Amino acid sequence: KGKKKKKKVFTKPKKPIHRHKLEKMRALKYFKVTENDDGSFKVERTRDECPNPVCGAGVFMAQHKDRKYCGKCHLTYAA
RNA sequence: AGCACCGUGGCGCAGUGGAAGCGCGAUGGGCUCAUAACCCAUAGGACGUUGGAUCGAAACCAACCGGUGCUACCA
RNA sequence: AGGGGGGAGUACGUUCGCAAGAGUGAAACUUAAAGAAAUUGACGGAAUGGCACCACAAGACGUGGAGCGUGCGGUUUAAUUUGACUCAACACGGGGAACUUUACCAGAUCCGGACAGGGUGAGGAUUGACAGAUUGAGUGUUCUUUCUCGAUCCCCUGAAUGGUGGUGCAUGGCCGCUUUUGGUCGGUGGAGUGAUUUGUUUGGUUGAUUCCGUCAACGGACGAGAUCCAAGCUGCCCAGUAGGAUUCA
RNA sequence: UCCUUGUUUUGCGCAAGGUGAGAUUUUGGGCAACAGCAGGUCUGUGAUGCUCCUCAAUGUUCUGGGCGACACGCGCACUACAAUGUCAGUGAGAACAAGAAAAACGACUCUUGUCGGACCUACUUGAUCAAAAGAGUGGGAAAACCCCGGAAUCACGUAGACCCACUUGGGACCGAGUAUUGCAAUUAUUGGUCGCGCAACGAGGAAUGUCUCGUAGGCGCAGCUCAUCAAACUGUGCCGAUUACGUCC
Numbered sequence: 001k002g003k004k005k006k007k008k009v010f011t012k013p014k015k016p017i018h019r020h021k022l023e024k025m026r027a028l029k030y031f032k033v034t035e036n037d038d039g040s041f042k043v044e045r046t047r048d049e050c051p052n053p054v055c056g057a058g059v060f061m062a063q064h065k066d067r068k069y070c071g072k073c074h075l076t077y078a079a
Numbered sequence: 080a081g082c083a084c085c086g087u088g089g090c091g092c093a094g095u096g097g098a099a100g101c102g103c104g105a106u107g108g109g110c111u112c113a114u115a116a117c118c119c120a121u122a123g124g125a126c127g128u129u130g131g132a133u134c135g136a137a138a139c140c141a142a143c144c145g146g147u148g149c150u151a152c153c154a
Numbered sequence: 155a156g157g158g159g160g161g162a163g164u165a166c167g168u169u170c171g172c173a174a175g176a177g178u179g180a181a182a183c184u185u186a187a188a189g190a191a192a193u194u195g196a197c198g199g200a201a202u203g204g205c206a207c208c209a210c211a212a213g214a215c216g217u218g219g220a221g222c223g224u225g226c227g228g229u230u231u232a233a234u235u236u237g238a239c240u241c242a243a244c245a246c247g248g249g250g251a252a253c254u255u256u257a258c259c260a261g262a263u264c265c266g267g268a269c270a271g272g273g274u275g276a277g278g279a280u281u282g283a284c285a286g287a288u289u290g291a292g293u294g295u296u297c298u299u300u301c302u303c304g305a306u307c308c309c310c311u312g313a314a315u316g317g318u319g320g321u322g323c324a325u326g327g328c329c330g331c332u333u334u335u336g337g338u339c340g341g342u343g344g345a346g347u348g349a350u351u352u353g354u355u356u357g358g359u360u361g362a363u364u365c366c367g368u369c370a371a372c373g374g375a376c377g378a379g380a381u382c383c384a385a386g387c388u389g390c391c392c393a394g395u396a397g398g399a400u401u402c403a
Numbered sequence: 404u405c406c407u408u409g410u411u412u413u414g415c416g417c418a419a420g421g422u423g424a425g426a427u428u429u430u431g432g433g434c435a436a437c438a439g440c441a442g443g444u445c446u447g448u449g450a451u452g453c454u455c456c457u458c459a460a461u462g463u464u465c466u467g468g469g470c471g472a473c474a475c476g477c478g479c480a481c482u483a484c485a486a487u488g489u490c491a492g493u494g495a496g497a498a499c500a501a502g503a504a505a506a507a508c509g510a511c512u513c514u515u516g517u518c519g520g521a522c523c524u525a526c527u528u529g530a531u532c533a534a535a536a537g538a539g540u541g542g543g544a545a546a547a548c549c550c551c552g553g554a555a556u557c558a559c560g561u562a563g564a565c566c567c568a569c570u571u572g573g574g575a576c577c578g579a580g581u582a583u584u585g586c587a588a589u590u591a592u593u594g595g596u597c598g599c600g601c602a603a604c605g606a607g608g609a610a611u612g613u614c615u616c617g618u619a620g621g622c623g624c625a626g627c628u629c630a631u632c633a634a635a636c637u638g639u640g641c642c643g644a645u646u647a648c649g650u651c652c
Contacts (some may be wrong), residue, residue, distance in 0.1 A: 001257060001320090002235080007239055015295065018294075018296070018353085019282085021300090022278085023300090023301090024277045026277070043234090062284090062299090062301040062302090064285075064299060064300060064301090065299080067285060069284055069285080069301060070271090070302085071300075071301035072301080073300035074282090074283055074284055
C-alpha cells in the first residue's frame with residue numbers, strides 16, 4: 001500500500017467539456033408557411049421524416065452537405 | 080667492510096633424505112533470543128635464485144641475492 | 155548502668171604503667187532515620203524430591219551434497235504493491251494471480267456530489283449520436299456538422315460520499331501464544347493483638363489439586379473427570395436403489 | 404469384573420495370568436479454568452474513533468497496455484526426483500481398494516401460469532490405419548447412471564530383454580510440428596511424439612527435524628482452488644516393520 005499526493009505532468013490544452021449547441025425556434029425553421037391563397041394556408045416542410053417504426057410519428061431527419069442522417073435511429077441515407 | 084644467523088601459504092613459523100603441514104587469517108556455512116566463545120567446509124605454495132653432491136630431498140655443499148643482529152668507522 | 159543515630163571511647167587534663175596501654179571522659183559539627191521481632195515474596199557457586207519422543211537414552215526415516223518447483227532475504231527496474239521475522243515469520247495471509255482479481259506504474263474515461271438556499275421564458279438550462287478529424291481506440295472523450303431528447307439532468311458556494319489511504323501503541327470481534335502443564339477462588343469454623351495461616355500439609359498413589367492415610371477442619375464452585383463425535387463386536391429393524399439359495403429349461 | 408488369597412496397611416492401588424469382539428484415560432478427536440501479551444489482523448464485513456483524499460480524485464474505472472507472490476552473479480526455508488540390480492529398468496500377462504464429487508443462472512417452447520438445455524459419465528462411431536482431437540446417441544438429481552468403481556505398491560514354472568557402466572541409471576536444459584481451453588495463451592499455459600542426454604548426481608561435513616502399532620516408511624486415488632494448469636493443502640484406502648516400554652545426564 002502506502003500513498004502520496006501529486007498528479008501534474010499537465011501543461012497541454014486540456015479538453016473543453018461538451019456543451020449543448022443551441023438552435024432557437026426549431027419548429028419554425030422546419031415548417032414553412034406561405035402567402036395566403038384561397039383563404040387556405042399551405043404548410044410545407046424542409047425536413048422529411050424517416051421511415052422506420054421508431055421514427056414513424058413526427059420525427060424528422062437531417063441535412064448535411066454530403067449525407068442525410070436521422071438522430072433518432074442513427075441512420076444514413078447518403079447523398 | 081667483514082663475521083654470524085635467517086629466507087617455506089596473506090602474516091608468524093614447524094619439518095636432520097622416501098619429501099606440503101600448523102597456528103593466526105580471508106571467504107561461506109553451523110551452533111546461540113543476539114554477541115563473545117566454539118566447530119566444519121572452501122580457495123591460497125617457482126620450499127629466495129642458480130649450479131653441484133646424492134638411486135632419490137625443501138633439508139647437505141658452493142656461488143649470488145635479500146633481511147636482521149654483532150664487530151668495522153676507512154687518507 | 156542507660157536517655158534518637160553519628161562525631162567518640164576520640165579531644166584536653168590527670169592518676170597509674172618500663173613499654174604496650176589501663177581508669178576517668180567532652181564539644182564543635184552533622185543527620186531523619188539507625189535499630190528489634192515476625193510474615194509474605196524473590197535469590198543462592200545450601201539441602202532434597204518430581205515430570206515431558208516439540209528433552210535425552212535405543213534406532214528406525216529424513217533434511218544439510220546435487221538437479222527442480224515454491225516461499226523469504228538481497229540486487230535491478232517506470233513499477234517489480236504489501237503483511238509476517240527465535241520457539242508462536244519463511245507451499246503462511248485458502249496468496250496454484252494471463253484479463254478481471256489488485257493494492258503498484260504509464261495514459262484516457264465516468265459521477266456513484268445526496269440535499270436546493272443562490273442563477274436558467276414558448277427556444278430554455280438539457281441527453282445521445284452518423285460522418286470527417288483528434289486519439290492506443292470504426293472510443294461523440296473532444297471539435298466541426300446537423301439532427302435527437304425526461305426539464306430532477308445543468309451552472310456556483312456550503313455539505314454529503316466513497317476509499318485494500320494512515321494509525322493494530324484509538325477500538326470492537328476473532329485467532330495465536332503464555333500452558334497441556336494441573337491449576338484457580340470464596341464461605342463458615344479454628345489459631346494469632348495482625349501482616350498471615352489452616353483448608354490447598356509431611357507420606358503413599360494416579361495422566362490428573364486423581365484418590366487414600368494422618369489430621370482443626372467441614373462443605374462448595376470452575377479446570378481435571380464426566381457429557382459429546384468417529385472406529386472395533388453385537389440385538390431389534392429392513393430391501394423392487396442391498397445379495398443370496400434351490401428348482402426347471 | 405474374576406483369579407493369583409502374589410504385592411499392598413485392613414486402605415488407595417499395583418504386577419502377572421484368565422475371561423472376552425475389545426483389558427485399562429478400550430482406540431483416535433472435539434471441548435477446556437484463573438491471570439495475562441502494549442503477539443497478529445484497520446487486505447474478511449453497512450465492525451469502527453480520529454485524521455487524509457475528494458470532479459484534471461488516493462473515489463468509481465470489471466477501459467487499453469505493463470507490473471504482481473515471475474523480472475537475476477548470490478544466501479536461506481519447505482517440497483519433489485535421483486544416484487539402480489533388496490521391483491532394478493524400458494516389455495508382457497494375472498489379481499485388486501474407499502471415503503468423496505454432479506442440478507441452476509429471466510433466454511427457449513409450454514398453457515395460463517411451466518418444459519428442455521448450460522454439470523458429469525457410458526456406449527457407439529471416428530478407425531479400410533499415430534497420439535491428442537472430432538461427432539452422434541443414451542443414462543443419472545446420486546445405495547439406481549458412472550459401478551461388479553478392473554488403483555498403484557504387488558505377484559510370474561513369463562526358459563523376455565538388460566549386466567555394474569554415469570550404461571539401456573537419471574534426466575536438467577534445448578529445437579521443430581500439432582491439437583484443445585479462453586474474449587485475449589507472445590515472457591513458450593496446458594496435453595500429446597521425434598531429436599537434444601557426451602547437463603548434474605555414484606549415498607552425502609559441521610549440524611539438525613518428529614516419531615512407540617495398523618504406528619514409522621513406501622504407494623496411489625479423490626475433494627479443495629476452478630475456462631485452463633498442484634511437486635501444495637484437506638480427506639480416504641492399500642502394502643506394512645526395527646528398537647525401547649526407561650531416565651534425568
